[PDB]
């Protein structure tokens, strides 16, 4: 498989690594999202230590108002992060 | 770096591998998009052999009507592909 194909699989893997920990196994609740950011985006994003910081990230990500981040919402997060990395080149 | 972080970098790398070949170095024209699909998505997508097949993919991807796929439009493509892989689990 190509690097692109392996990357696609990695996006799916990391979502499930975190989404299945608690509650709805197909969505990231705030606690799971905090863990994902702190453990898997430690070189790109500042560590989240306060509940209000994760509340704000979830508010940005949660487009259907259920308080959790589903797979489509996670795709949008990944697009935001990748665009940020891509910029300040 | 985490698998997620490496995946983010791979998305950026593959875009530039193809976007810089011709014309606007920051966008994929149809010919570049065809090469990317055929060479980097050969396990996920059927090979594109006809101009009309790439025309249709570009039509789907091109949200600002310039006939090319920019980085944001490529992000949307990546989201489509990843969602497809994720489904039929
Ligand atoms: N969140 C921040 N403020 C932050 C700033 C810098 C920083 O640096 C270390 C991370 C290194 C990431 C670079 C990996 C991929 O980078 C690129 C590759 C290609 C291109 C490009 N040609 N546009 C741009 C960036 C990390 C976090
Ligand atoms: N385009 C097609 N029709 C097609 C169908 C099957 C096909 O199979 C070979 C590709 C193997 C891809 C699997 C890699 C990642 O897969 C998943 C991982 C986790 C999950 C999940 N738990 N949702 C789903 C899929 C390729 C192309
Ligand atoms: Ca969950
Ligand atoms: Ca939601
Ligand atoms: Ca180009
Ligand atoms: Ca365009």
UniProtKB/Swiss-Prot annotation, chains A, B:
Annotated compartments: Cytoplasm; Nucleus; Secreted
Residue sites binding Ca(2+) 2 per the record: 62, 64, 66, 68, 73
Entry keyword Metal-binding: yes
Name the record gives this protein: Protein S100-B
Top-level taxon in the UniProt lineage: Eukaryota
Record GO cellular component, one term: extracellular region
Any Pfam family the entry gives: S_100
Boundaries of every EF-hand domain copy: 13-48, 49-84
Function recorded in the entry: Small zinc- and- and calcium-binding protein that is highly expressed in astrocytes and constitutes one of the most abundant soluble proteins in brain. Weakly binds calcium but binds zinc very tightly-distinct binding sites with different affinities exist for both ions on each monomer. Physiological concentrations of potassium ion antagonize the binding of both divalent cations, especially affecting high-affinity calcium-binding sites. Acts as a neurotrophic factor that promotes astrocytosis and axonal proliferation.
Alphabetized InterPro entries for the sequence: EF-hand-dom_pair (IPR011992), EF_Hand_1_Ca_BS (IPR018247), EF_hand_dom (IPR002048), S100-B (IPR028481), S100/CaBP7/8-like_CS (IPR001751), S100_Ca-bd_sub (IPR013787)
One function term, GO molecular function aspect: calcium ion binding
Entry binding sites for Zn(2+): 16, 26, 86
Binding of Ca(2+) 1, residues: 19, 22, 24
Modified residues (N-acetylserine): 2
Record-linked SUPFAM superfamilies: EF-hand (SSF47473)
Keywords on record: Acetylation, Calcium, Cell adhesion, Cytoplasm, Metal-binding, Nucleus, Repeat, Secreted, Zinc
Gene transcribed to yield this protein: S100B
Record organism: Bos taurus
Any GO BP: positive regulation of neuron differentiation
Subunit structure: Dimer of either two alpha chains, or two beta chains, or one alpha and one beta chain. The S100B dimer binds two molecules of STK38. Interacts with CACYBP in a calcium-dependent manner. Interacts with ATAD3A; this interaction probably occurs in the cytosol prior to ATAD3A mitochondrial targeting. Interacts with S100A6. The S100B dimer interacts with two molecules of CAPZA1. Interacts with AGER. Interacts with PPP5C (via TPR repeats); the interaction is calcium-dependent and modulates PPP5C activity. Interacts with TPPP; this interaction inhibits TPPP dimerization.
Keyword Translocase: no
């Amino acid at each position: 498989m190509s690097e692109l194909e392996k990357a696609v699989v990695a996006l799916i893997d990391v979502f499930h690594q975190y989404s299945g920990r608690e509650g709805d196994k197909h969505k990231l609740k705030k606690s799971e999202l905090k863990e994902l950011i702190n453990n898997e985006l430690s070189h790109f994003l500042e560590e989240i230590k306060e509940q209000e910081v994760v509340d704000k990230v979830m508010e940005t990500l949660d487009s259907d108002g259920d308080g959790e981040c589903d797979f489509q919402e996670f795709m949008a997060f990944v697009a935001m992060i990748t665009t940020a990395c891509h910029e300040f080149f």
